[PDB]
Design a protein around this ligand. Structure first.
Ligand code: CO
Length: 141
């Protein structure tokens, strides 16, 4: 499959534009969260640059809502999303990515929270990818 940020906009909106009144928007240099208002009546997650990886990262952060500690769970969702989509994962070293790996394992063993779980299933149906298995997430070596 190809991977274009425009695809993530449609997948995200399909998952969340109704239930959570939230949509994904390609922005400029800044990631932003803009709540619905009287003119634009839906919440907007704005990601920086027309870059697939950047959209994934803002989606992960939205799902979760000392920099290492705060970044572990969003980067774990990043990794899950990328494998679900058939996209290559990188962080943005080995010690930190092992913390992310453990958190992916935690999620897979103990349960993925509702919003990322929904996004993962939609990714799988959009890109026709097999069910996730821990084996698709190699320990950082
Ligand atoms: Co981040």
């Amino acid at each position: 499959s190809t991977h274009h940020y425009e695809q993530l906009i449609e997948i995200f909106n399909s998952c969340f534009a109704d239930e959570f009144n939230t949509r994904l928007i390609k922005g400029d240099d800044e990631p932003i969260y803009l709540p619905a208002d009287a003119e634009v009546p839906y919440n907007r997650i704005v990601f920086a640059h027309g870059f697939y990886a950047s959209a994934i990262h803002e989606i992960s952060h939205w799902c979760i809502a000392q920099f290492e500690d705060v970044e572990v769970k969003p980067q774990a969702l990043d990794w899950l999303f990328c494998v679900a989509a058939g996209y290559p994962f990188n962080v943005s070293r080995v010690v930190f990515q092992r913390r992310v790996h453990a958190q992916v394992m935690d999620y897979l063993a103990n349960g993925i929270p509702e919003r990322p779980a929904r996004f993962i299933k939609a990714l799988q149906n959009y890109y026709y990818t097999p069910e996730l298995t821990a084996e698709q997430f190699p320990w950082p070596e």
